[PDB]
């Protein structure tokens, strides 16, 4: 019994951080419930790692999550900071709301992609047990 979700993520300029949260009945895990923080870059590492694992040949590895694109929204919010004095106050609020909804739309799609990939892994009978996958799930030494 492995259940995985991403409750929250942060988009911050340089990177995107995903909180990957796990509930398990598996004994092999030290704890039943935990969370660790993973970058997109990490999921790709896992996927890369799985794909090249020899035992797992003749298994189909779930597709990796696509890289998050916050660029459009990011540029606008960077400008918006730019316009705080100058802009009519109302415009700024509407502009703030719209930019946020835009960031939000991206998050939803991207969170799903990353979440689905992990959930797809947990579902798999063989893959669910992979060591590299386990560390990704639980190694929370910051």
């Amino acid at each position: 019994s492995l259940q995985i979700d991403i409750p929250d993520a942060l988009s911050e300029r340089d990177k995107v951080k995903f909180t990957v949260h796990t509930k398990t009945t598996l004994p092999t895990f030290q704890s039943p419930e935990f969370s660790v923080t993973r970058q997109h870059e990490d999921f790709v590492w896992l996927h890369d790692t799985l794909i090249e694992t020899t035992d797992y040949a003749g298994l189909i590895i779930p597709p990796a999550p696509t890289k998050p694109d916050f660029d459009g929204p990011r540029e606008k919010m960077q400008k918006l900071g730019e316009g705080e004095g100058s802009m009519t106050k109302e415009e700024f609020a509407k502009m703030k709301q719209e930019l946020e909804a835009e960031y939000l739309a991206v998050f939803k799609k991207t969170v799903s992609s990353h979440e689905v990939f992990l959930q797809r892994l947990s579902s798999h009978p063989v893959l669910s047990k992979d060591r590299n996958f386990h560390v990704f799930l639980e190694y929370d030494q910051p």
Binding site: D5, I6, D8, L10, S11, E12, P73, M77, E100, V111
Partner: peptide, 21 residues
């Protein structure tokens, strides 16, 4: 320019929060 995402508690709608950077 850092944006924080919270998944909605079911069936709670999802959110984004500005952060300070």
């Amino acid at each position: 320019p850092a944006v924080q995402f919270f998944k909605g508690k079911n069936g709670s709608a999802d959110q984004v929060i500005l952060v300070t950077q």
